[PDB]
Ligand binder design. Sequence first.
Ligand SMILES: CC(C)CCC[C@@H](C)[C@H]1CC[C@H]2[C@@H]3CC=C4C[C@@H](O)CC[C@]4(C)[C@H]3CC[C@]12C
Ligand SMILES: CC(C)CCC[C@@H](C)[C@H]1CC[C@H]2[C@@H]3CC=C4C[C@@H](O)CC[C@]4(C)[C@H]3CC[C@]12C
Lengths: 338, 276, 53, 215
Amino acid sequence: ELDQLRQEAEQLKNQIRDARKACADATLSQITNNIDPVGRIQMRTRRTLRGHLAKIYAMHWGTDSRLLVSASQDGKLIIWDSYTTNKVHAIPLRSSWVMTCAYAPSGNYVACGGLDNICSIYNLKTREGNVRVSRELAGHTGYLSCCRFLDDNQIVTSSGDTTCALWDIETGQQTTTFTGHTGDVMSLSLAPDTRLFVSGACDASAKLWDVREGMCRQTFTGHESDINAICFFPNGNAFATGSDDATCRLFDLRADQELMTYSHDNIICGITSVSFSKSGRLLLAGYDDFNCNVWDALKADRAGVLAGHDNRVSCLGVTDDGMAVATGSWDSFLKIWN
Amino acid sequence: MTNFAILMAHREIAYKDGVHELLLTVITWVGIVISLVCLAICIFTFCFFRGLQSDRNTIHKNLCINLFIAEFIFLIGIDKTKYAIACPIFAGLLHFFFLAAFAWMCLEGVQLYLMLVEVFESEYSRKKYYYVAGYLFPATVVGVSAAIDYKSYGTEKACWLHVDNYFIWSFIGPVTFIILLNIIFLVITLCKMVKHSNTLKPDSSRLENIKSWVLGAFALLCLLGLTWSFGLLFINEETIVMAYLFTIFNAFQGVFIFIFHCALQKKVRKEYGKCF
Amino acid sequence: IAQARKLVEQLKMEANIDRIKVSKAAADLMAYCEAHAKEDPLLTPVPASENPF
Amino acid sequence: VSAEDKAAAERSKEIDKCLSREKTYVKRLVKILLLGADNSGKSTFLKQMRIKGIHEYDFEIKNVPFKMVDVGGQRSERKRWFECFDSVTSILFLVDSSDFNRLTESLNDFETIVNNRVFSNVSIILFLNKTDLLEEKVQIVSIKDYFLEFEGDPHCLRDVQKFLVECFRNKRRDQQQKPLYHHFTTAINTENARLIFRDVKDTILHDNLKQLMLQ
Ligand SMILES: CC(C)CCC[C@@H](C)[C@H]1CC[C@H]2[C@@H]3CC=C4C[C@@H](O)CC[C@]4(C)[C@H]3CC[C@]12C
Ligand SMILES: CC(C)CCC[C@@H](C)[C@H]1CC[C@H]2[C@@H]3CC=C4C[C@@H](O)CC[C@]4(C)[C@H]3CC[C@]12C
């Protein structure tokens, strides 16, 4: 009888809730009460990157901290040089509906995806100097929402069919499939050690996955709406979430709980992107009210505002050395702050 | 001094003892100064912001630039008849720049036609054709006119063209043709507005629709330059009303252009707010 | 059914783990932030002589 | 040193030239989103035009580029992230006007699609197909057997056509937006492009007129 199984599930949920209530001895605010505030963070725009003909949906920084790639709805990928504001490559795409962009850690390949349900890998450093398609990863039954590189031969992707997959580029076949999400998966973040990753879907839940075994380790709840963005803490023992309820939250892996909420009464719009600082003290979130807010991750206080865009901010990322921040928006521009 | 009504005067007007000349010249000076200030503001507005760039912004900007230059030259060198070399040069510069302003005024109506009759856009770009027309029409007209008679570029009363030998028609005629074309274009535009205002919001109070139409017509009259027809009817002291209407509606043209295309538009105001 | 049994199995797997105190986690986060504070160019502005932008 | 800078500047200039060349073509392209069901007759309508996930069709009418986007299977998405089609000019809706059982489902789908915040700057074109099948049905089968809130004779094709038009029109709450166009086609008519052309031209003409009235 399924009733006994439902009772077992309810009993396990109650046991988990009791354990979590037992573990909660003090809040993060009380502990970080006497820490001096960061102050006022005033950032100015240093570079403006123009040339896209439509709304910009995704971007990714390079490991060398100089080159970045952006995706637009005109059906083109552009690779820029931030230092000199120069276009290195322009890659026409077969499908005009692009929602994701990724940059390889070694800088040899670039991934792309969208409504075509395919992920394509482009070889930048090829013979004769003509960027060409190297692979087309097919096997998903929904639109591709995110994709991250592990190395030159492994890529993890998420789709709207409530599944995530691990691919072998040289073969083109899924090595592992991560199932268990109810809603469509929207975000994806890789741990610094590249042995775990966290995912967020439209079921207001987040899950911790093991890349090796291929199972779900923990499930985090608390949001009241869909989750759009997710990011990992610099050390790797915590992660932050961004939802449509105009709130951001911080979860701890070891305590299996929530630690702080980042919300204000004057903010009613949902979060589209989230990112962290090199040391972790600053949390950056992008909103669709044409604005971006900087938070104090330890005291949950606003510290600054990045108001330069005249349309919705869709993408956001912080460079590896922590020197600059690049934001993309629906106005077809990229601005670099410092 | 001299008033603004000498530009459109195919006859030598005799003035009876009175206050008409002084009032007309005072109105000319005040209107041209305030129009120069407003035109400078409009030029900065149209050239600075990159979110306002289009195929009509270029026409607006070139019209404002030409009007500014022409009115500055008018205020500087229209009473310099005591200089035997400067005066013809001043007259020629005034001729060229006023003709350029009128060419861009005609391009405004051509843009209206290209917007309302042929709805879709073109495969090529029309900017080069705009720049060719609006700067090659005045050059050709002034060059041909100076080739025939070049001693007619100075008058004993003002630095303008001669009247006795029909040399003023080299400026008057093209303006009349442009005005007729703009009248045709405005009639077509108003007919389209009336016909297609019964499709969108088909049923509404007749008063508000008339208010919208008259406001649109007022906005378009500053760019079409149809208020230059008053000067054609100023022939003697009996029709002194035409001179007043000409100098009142035309010396304040920059003010109207500013009011209608920089302060009652939401895009310009939101750009200025962005600068705040 | 199979789906309910699988859900029960996953819940049992997630219900038996070693959880640490919240205060310990907060202290660890603060310690990391204080230890890596000097290497954050966004937290501490740097002179323009060393700024690539 | 200098050679690398010159080469990089030249490459950036060539890329900018290519983008500038394609901008003009991008500016003058018309995108229309195609919606409907299996019984509507989208396949026959597309096949008989005579000039995966997402399918796109390209055609030219009177030297004007057109593009039709057919979502198809992915239309089942009910998340706001799927509404990236806010740059389209119009939406082409196909329904079957010969089956009264599916009419209420079609009306619900039309209401859901039209009354969306993202579809505020787009016009709607409604095609009512299978008029020939409807003509033989309005006599043998009475429309009053399914909609008991209508007035008029049921054996008149014109009356039931007006009834269906009013039913589809009354579900739109955005009455101060781009207008709604309706037609009675048969999915094989050779004049199905010279209607979309006129509707799109009318929509763009109302867009141009709205900028002249300072509204
Ligand atoms: C851009 C163009 C239109 C401006 C050039 C001026 C044109 C219109 C020409 C036409 C007639 C010309 C004038 C005709 C006669 C004389 C008298 C002579 O002793 C000196 C030159 C002078 C004073 C000429 C100056 C230039 C002039 C005014
Ligand atoms: C591109 C140009 C040619 C278009 C037409 C311009 C017209 C308005 C110009 C061009 C040349 C001009 C003529 C040039 C010289 C003279 C001789 C003079 O005794 C009377 C005016 C008269 C006869 C001008 C009349 C106006 C005129 C015909």
